[PDB]
Design a protein around this ligand. Sequence first.
Ligand code: PNS
Ligand code: PNS
Ligand code: PNS
Ligand code: PNS
Ligand code: PNS
Ligand code: PNS
Ligand code: CL
Ligand code: CL
Ligand code: CL
Ligand code: CL
Ligand code: CL
Ligand code: CL
Ligand code: NA
Ligand code: NA
Ligand code: NA
Lengths: 238, 238, 238, 236, 236, 236, 78, 78, 78, 78, 78, 78
Amino acid sequence: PGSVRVVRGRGLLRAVLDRPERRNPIDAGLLTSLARALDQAESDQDCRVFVLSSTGEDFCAGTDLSEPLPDGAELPYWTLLERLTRSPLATVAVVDGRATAGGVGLAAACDLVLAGERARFRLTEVLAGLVPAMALPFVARRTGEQRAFAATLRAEEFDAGAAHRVGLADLAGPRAEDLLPPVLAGLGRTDRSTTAALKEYRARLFPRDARLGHDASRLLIERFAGTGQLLARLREAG
Amino acid sequence: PGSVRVVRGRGLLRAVLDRPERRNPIDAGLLTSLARALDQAESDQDCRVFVLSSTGEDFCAGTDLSEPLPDGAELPYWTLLERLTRSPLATVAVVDGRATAGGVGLAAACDLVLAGERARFRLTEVLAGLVPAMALPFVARRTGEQRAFAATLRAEEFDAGAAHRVGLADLAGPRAEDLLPPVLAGLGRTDRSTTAALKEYRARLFPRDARLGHDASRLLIERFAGTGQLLARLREAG
Amino acid sequence: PGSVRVVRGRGLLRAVLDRPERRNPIDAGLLTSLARALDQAESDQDCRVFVLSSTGEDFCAGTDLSEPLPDGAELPYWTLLERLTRSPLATVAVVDGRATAGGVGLAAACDLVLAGERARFRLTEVLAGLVPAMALPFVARRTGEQRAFAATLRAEEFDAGAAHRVGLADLAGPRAEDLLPPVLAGLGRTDRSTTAALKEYRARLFPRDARLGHDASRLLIERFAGTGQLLARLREAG
Amino acid sequence: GSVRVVRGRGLLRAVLDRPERRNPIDAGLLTSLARALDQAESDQDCRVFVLSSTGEDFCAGTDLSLPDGAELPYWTLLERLTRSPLATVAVVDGRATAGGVGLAAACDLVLAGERARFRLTEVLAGLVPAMALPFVARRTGEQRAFAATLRAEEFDAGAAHRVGLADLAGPRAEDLLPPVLAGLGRTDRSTTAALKEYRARLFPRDARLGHDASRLLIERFAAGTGQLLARLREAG
Amino acid sequence: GSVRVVRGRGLLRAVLDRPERRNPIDAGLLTSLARALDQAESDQDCRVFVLSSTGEDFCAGTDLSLPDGAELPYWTLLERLTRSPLATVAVVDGRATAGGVGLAAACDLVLAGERARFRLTEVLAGLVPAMALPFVARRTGEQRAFAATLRAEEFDAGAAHRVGLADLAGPRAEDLLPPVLAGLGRTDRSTTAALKEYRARLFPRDARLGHDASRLLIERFAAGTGQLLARLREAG
Amino acid sequence: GSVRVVRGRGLLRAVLDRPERRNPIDAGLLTSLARALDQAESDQDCRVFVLSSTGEDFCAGTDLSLPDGAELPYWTLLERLTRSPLATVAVVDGRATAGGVGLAAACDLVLAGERARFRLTEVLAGLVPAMALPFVARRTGEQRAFAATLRAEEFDAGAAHRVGLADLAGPRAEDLLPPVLAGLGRTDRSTTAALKEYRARLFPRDARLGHDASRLLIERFAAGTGQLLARLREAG
Amino acid sequence: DPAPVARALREELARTLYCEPGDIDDEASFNTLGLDSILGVEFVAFVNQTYGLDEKAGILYDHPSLAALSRHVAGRAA
Amino acid sequence: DPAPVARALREELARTLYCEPGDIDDEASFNTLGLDSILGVEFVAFVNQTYGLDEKAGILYDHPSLAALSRHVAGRAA
Amino acid sequence: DPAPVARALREELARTLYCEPGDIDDEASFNTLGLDSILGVEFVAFVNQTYGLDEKAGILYDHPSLAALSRHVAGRAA
Amino acid sequence: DPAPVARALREELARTLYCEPGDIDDEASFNTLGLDSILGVEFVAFVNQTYGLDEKAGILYDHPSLAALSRHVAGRAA
Amino acid sequence: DPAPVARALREELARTLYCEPGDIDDEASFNTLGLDSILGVEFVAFVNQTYGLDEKAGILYDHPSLAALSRHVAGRAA
Amino acid sequence: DPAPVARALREELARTLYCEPGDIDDEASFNTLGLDSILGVEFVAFVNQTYGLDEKAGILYDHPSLAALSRHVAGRAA
Ligand SMILES: *P(=O)(O)OCC(C)(C)[C@@H](O)C(=O)NCCC(=O)NCCS
Ligand SMILES: *P(=O)(O)OCC(C)(C)[C@@H](O)C(=O)NCCC(=O)NCCS
Ligand SMILES: *P(=O)(O)OCC(C)(C)[C@@H](O)C(=O)NCCC(=O)NCCS
Ligand SMILES: *P(=O)(O)OCC(C)(C)[C@@H](O)C(=O)NCCC(=O)NCCS
Ligand SMILES: *P(=O)(O)OCC(C)(C)[C@@H](O)C(=O)NCCC(=O)NCCS
Ligand SMILES: *P(=O)(O)OCC(C)(C)[C@@H](O)C(=O)NCCC(=O)NCCS
Ligand SMILES: [Cl-]
Ligand SMILES: [Cl-]
Ligand SMILES: [Cl-]
Ligand SMILES: [Cl-]
Ligand SMILES: [Cl-]
Ligand SMILES: [Cl-]
Ligand code: NA
Ligand code: NA
Ligand code: NA
């Protein structure tokens, strides 16, 4: 009876996006439910891995088309993507359907991305007059800046193979779920302490400045604030 | 009767390098003519795209082998490449011949690079005892640092396919001009306001420091100031 | 009668790792011997290239499994890798066997990496509860951050072809030694002055902050300081 | 109805012109294509026969909506596309399905665009594509042609290019045609005629294969087939 | 000893079950596989014959530890895997060496996992793999099959996939099997039977080739061979 | 003039040695290569025949500067390179043009360097390369050999490697030779002889093909040809 | 209500795809599980036979998971 | 007669696709021409505003060439 | 009888490989199953602690499947 | 002076390359337009016939565009 | 002591690999030089014949360079 | 006799290409040897300074091997 279904396994917690009839959109409850799953995982000292998986044809469709910002404040979406890069747990995204708009950032912010045959990634934001400012740093840290910016300007779609070729997926196969057991068995050779120190050192060597989450939050809110027309266009094409 | 021929189309201005008999070299007049085309494009509020194309076998041969620098000052070449990354217009380079030395930066600084069968890219600068300091940040933001520095150290030549594989070209085909209609039709799905906010955010997430254009200008001037011998060698091999 | 055998050629000095029976491990004497070879090369004003090559099946096995840190201090390993990126000489790594743990950084810190059929690269550090903090910036400046961090988390092994595909090797062939003559002949078209200005400008455009060598040194020392168990495990699997 | 002819400089083009029916194979199409190839061959200044189509279906194969020694007209036409003194060029910018794959495969050169798809659906209907396979296998090799049949494998432009079913691929098959026509203008009809005659001398099909292939398709169609065809219908 | 049979839904599986001996070819294996294929063919509801193995060796080839018109049982079995009305599927998750390559190659479909290796070692022993080559060459083409023999080339899963020796590759050959079985359930035995019969009609082996191939292997084995086999033994 | 012979350990090398004329085919070259292959075959300790060249042209083909049952010496030589008991190895470090492609293609193994180029120019001159095509098609498959002829396609080392025309590619064909020679020292002449004899048993050319191919080249040369050859001359 | 319908469909899907019912995620798309348009039409004919319905093959597009189909079918059942 | 509509539609498609009206094969699929789903919605909204219609974006799937779309709009408009 | 050992080993291997005991082919190579040299050392240290043995990590090369390892440990343990 | 020469060459180039004269950019390299050495020799023989000249096939290398060739030819014309 | 053994082996290795003795790095791995298991067994039989030893083919694995093998062989020599 | 010139040129080429004079095939193209246009200019300037000549860089295209270059320089020098 929530948008995230939580499953415990051996040294892992799996958060399953569980609204397939709505295409697993991002709203308040999805971001809180995910933040709460991450909290339950991190509070278990024996947990080493957070697994993010989904349901149906839509991994995550992004913000639902079916906000004030205090100084230094960040939208919850930014807070969650940062958490996925900073958590002492290894974060693994399991993608076997459409990651669209904000869904691309949610997958990209995980340490490891697994893509199956039905995986698709596309930032549709420019087609709606938006800059995907909050997702871009999580895509660009995988694809490099040129491919992330050009894929945004052209609303480029990536299948599993193309996602793997540009760095957005680390592993590709017939089914993302079937790439997970070998990733989990490999992660069982290291521990949370090492995984934590490794993610911390990534932030040390490749930092995001302390203002970036605010500025990116502001840019998305400003552009959403003709947007009504372009979103109607996007739904009609959908 | 200039080194740039200007053509207007639907929401675009096309600047054509138009000295093929001289191999479309960079000199003062080419940089001013290009800066003036960009000005005419940006002043038209209905213009969304700046198209950079050329003539003959040489897209652009770089500085002509056929300067004082005040504090904080940048050479015009740097100013133009920055403009191509910061303009509110989408900048598209159409490359169907040799981009050599400074010609590589001029293409690389555009948002999108289209390469045809006859496209070639090569930084010859180290063969003349020069560092291509002003072009390198525009190449490296496409290729990554290792491939840009190694391609400079080895004076590596890229054809259309190789350019595409390393990120220097975004699209490759038999003819760069025939890749342009689909890029223009795709850009017509977004607007200048979105394109502007997207380029601004690229500068926000991947900045060049305010001293870089000066320091890069200085390094090129210092090395050009045995250079006479190495340029004679380069022309004799040409 | 040392761990480095030194050979002079035309505008080059070749440092050969010469302990194959011990798998060319990193210890104090290897780092001093290498630093001293680099000193002899840089002191010869006619020297333009430093060639790093090895013996047997192990290019370099990393720290030998067969340290106090003053403020601002860096471990000698960091000092040597930085020198290989800052030396006015072109630094070429010739890899025809296993580069393991610290051996990967030593190759990666050279300007050009040549990989033969028997080349293998793998950071085993996370399997021993370590972060390879000192090698990572030299790998990441070649592979990009995602592939360097993920290859560390998964202890990914690269053969010559895979190393070449991700940027860790610049050239691949049946034998790294047979790729060297063409690299040397190409480098003979430029000079030390240009090579020096090019490496300096790489540090200018893609800097490491002044604290990074200390912080990376500290992180490795902290984690080495259950490590005994995990190293026994690693040797038993070896 | 089914074919529209357009002449050009040293060429005749036969356009499959029934897109709303997905360009099916029937007696009308096969006869109109045989008559287009006759017209092209009778013009002694003609050198190229271009086969192109309309809409989303290059050719859907047999519309689902044999004396001794005789061959079905489909066999006869595919053999003519391999034996003609004209260079035969297939322009594939949509789905080539079942017998539609053989019609393309039998041309000297196959150009494949972004929307090109090839798939032999025959085994899903309990059939062997006996008449189309020799023209596919002479391009892909026997293993890929027989495994693609058993698995009803679908090829896009890149896959078709990689396995030899397409000689050239790109965003639009039609934009690959002018450089092919430019190239063929360097040679002549007599030289193309002798080259194709020598291919038949070096890679021959025995004289009985047309009858045998035709017979095998007729047997399996005259079988449980009406159901499998309904099923294939309901699946789309 | 050498083969373990497992039935499934419309299939029979023959498992090479002597891993500690590296699954060698002998009279026992060839006879047990012929008898598995007989059982599978006698069940009229059977449609697929699956050949899989154990441990690190798919099949090491002839254990190193002819009337006129007659063929060696190895030839007879390879031909049966190409002619059976059952779809034949090879699941390769280890080293296929010498005659072991022909046993895989002769199945309709070869699935290759991460540990799959193929190598004809015969010329290193002074032999021609005359009996295995037709089943390899019908997949790779004559040039790659004869140059791989001369050079005793080793293929991993990707290389085997690229040259046509494997139809499908992935981390485990066994995990490629369920989608292949799902796909084959769309067709039936009668349709598979006619397809394979038509492959023999289009790509025939002449009637004497079995005897001739068998003879060439026997001649060269009966030659300097005992030494070359020792050497191959000492090399492992 | 045209061939220089160098002996090595178990090998004879025939070097095309007229670089300033681009190593054309004439009666002198064909006879000197037949006589080199005779010498190599007469030495019972010889196992390998190496064909290599000089300058920028591996071989430019027929210098532009038939009783019943008889074959032209070019046919006879290409067949000998496929039938010899010696392993035949082509070292290609420049342009192989027209008949020069067949000379390489007919060797057991083709090594291709960075400057290797292959191109059948024949249709641009109104000719069919009838004598060279079987040796090309046995490597590339019939579709790529006939479409490369119709289009006068040029292959560099990588493209030649991808389509099977080259077995090995790298920066220099000559540096690929020592590992090939090292590998061939593991086998012997008797084993190589039987392998090549079995390739002819499995992939035969009928007895009339040499005459027919020779005849087709003679007919088209004896035709409008003098002009097309001038044109090909002026183009370079 | 739907849980028995879901199990009857899960066993049939398992047999069509040569896996065990316990290998099937009820929320996975039919495209992710590897059900093509052909076995899709057979699967719908199975639904129709077992539940006496007359659903079009298109229903696997409208309810593209075992969970979604089993709810649609149970709600059309007596 | 669909010819007047085909002309009005050909000119809008050429502007949308950055080609000349003369380059457009009326029987080519919109997919072959490179009309994406976004420019498809704009093109149908051009048809609606020009002829006083309100056809769903979906209409380009039903009639997926200029010629087929022209017959639809022709027989509809007046 | 190796069956009790094969069971104890199958359950540890499944936990190590993040599968169910039921998914493991006892005759599959450890390489085919994806047991690397690191998890191999942990697995042999499981065998040693459980049966009071001290077999070298090398033992998985000598007996490279669950079945072969089970016979080794069976005939060794008591 | 050259504009008529440029048009006569543009129409012949259009026919050799199976495009319309209006598709040809006079400033595009002959290599970009797709003119090989073979049709290059035919094109030069066309220039020679039409203008009574005796140019070598190499002239397409010296003046490697329609614009450049048409200026060279017009300046050699009466 | 080993330098003569090293030269006798270096000349034989040069002949097996179709290079000159001066092309061989005594410290290069046998795998880097391109010696396979087959010529490896012939090379060991050469060592045994020349030095009257009875080394197993495995010795090239224990001493995997010319330098290492030549020290092992010289120390087993009279 | 070109042999003295071929020797002087072979030694400069070996130094330029970082090989031994003995490794150079005199009849190999400069392209096959990896002499680029830049080292080509330096090599011709070596020929000019050594023999009192001033041959264009272009000479290596006219005589594109060591042997052909040696005959040219031989018959020219004195
Ligand atoms: P069935 O699996 O034999 O056939 C179904 C189909 C050929 C009609 C089907 O392939 C199709 O045309 N699908 C359109 C679906 C689609 O969007 N493709 C999937 C990639 S996103
Ligand atoms: P538009 O080019 O942005 O595409 C949007 C889309 C919904 C049409 C597309 O992204 C998608 O997911 N489906 C592709 C296949 C299609 O056209 N839809 C199937 C309807 S029958
Ligand atoms: P583990 O998966 O970390 O692998 C360590 C290793 C030593 C086994 C491996 O990295 C290696 O270098 N050898 C691979 C082949 C092997 O298993 N060893 C040969 C012993 S017979
Ligand atoms: P034509 O097109 O049949 O032949 C011309 C040619 C074979 C002489 C020509 O291909 C050639 O040798 N060109 C040298 C030109 C060159 O530099 N290649 C283009 C790549 S930059
Ligand atoms: P020989 O060269 O014919 O055969 C030796 C071998 C087949 C036993 C050998 O290939 C092998 O199995 N080696 C194991 C060695 C290994 O680890 N592979 C090299 C990649 S790291
Ligand atoms: P160098 O290796 O730097 O090359 C310079 C170059 C002018 C020779 C070259 O870059 C180029 O553009 N042409 C390549 C073909 C050639 O050698 N020139 C043709 C003259 S006939
Ligand atoms: Cl965003
Ligand atoms: Cl610059
Ligand atoms: Cl480190
Ligand atoms: Cl058919
Ligand atoms: Cl055999
Ligand atoms: Cl010929
Ligand atoms: Na996979
Ligand atoms: Na393209
Ligand atoms: Na190489």
